[PDB]
Design a protein around this ligand. Structure first.
Ligand SMILES: OC[C@H](CC(F)(F)F)Nc1ncnc2[nH]ccc12
Ligand SMILES: [Cl-]
Length: 167
């Protein structure tokens, strides 16, 4: 039993909800919140910009030190950093960004990072400003993640569309 509330159960382990991931994280304070990151950990817009703003830019400060030490992530890769005031940890995961010409096949690799954590709050990888089809992202999530994932989807039309089309 966990403290996630109001989710629709799609499969044994995947749940979904229309919610702002920022407001969700502040309420649940999950062990892990997933950020929709880029390889430079520059949290300028989308989920990343929103999560960073909620940390008063502390996420960006920590991220800049991470990059200065380690260099950029790989597309499909991840790193674990602090969750600041939002969660214990933030798993920064880089899905492919279609608006940059990146290979959508890397979306499965991106979701594989979730399997290293027993429970996660997350957005749909490569959705939104990363320019991929969110129905496809949800399908890859369900077919790749085996741990318990609670998906927040900020857009109700999409949320309703995601539910009604789910196979
Ligand atoms: O796939 C990314 C997803 C796209 C869409 F909005 F349509 F759901 N974006 C988000 N999902 C959940 N919380 C969020 N907070 C800020 C942005 C954001
Ligand atoms: Cl977005």
């Amino acid at each position: 039993v966990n403290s996630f509330s109001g989710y629709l159960k799609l499969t044994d382990n995947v749940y979904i909800k229309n919610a702002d991931i920022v407001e969700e994280a502040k309420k649940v304070k999950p062990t892990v919140v997933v950020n929709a990151a880029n390889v430079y950990l520059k949290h300028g817009g989308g989920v990343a910009g929103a999560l960073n703003k909620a940390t008063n830019n502390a996420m960006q400060v920590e991220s800049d030190d991470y990059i200065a030490t380690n260099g950029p992530l790989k597309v499909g890769g991840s790193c674990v950093l602090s969750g600041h005031n939002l969660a214990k940890h933030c798993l920064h995961v880089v899905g492919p960004n279609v608006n940059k010409g990146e290979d959508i096949q890397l979306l499965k690799s991106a979701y594989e990072n979730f399997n290293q954590h027993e429970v996660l709050l997350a957005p749909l990888l490569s959705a939104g400003i990363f320019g991929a089809d969110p129905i496809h992202s949800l399908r890859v999530c369900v077919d790749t993640v085996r741990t318990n994932v609670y998906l927040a989807v900020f857009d109700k039309n999409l949320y309703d569309k995601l539910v009604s089309s789910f196979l």
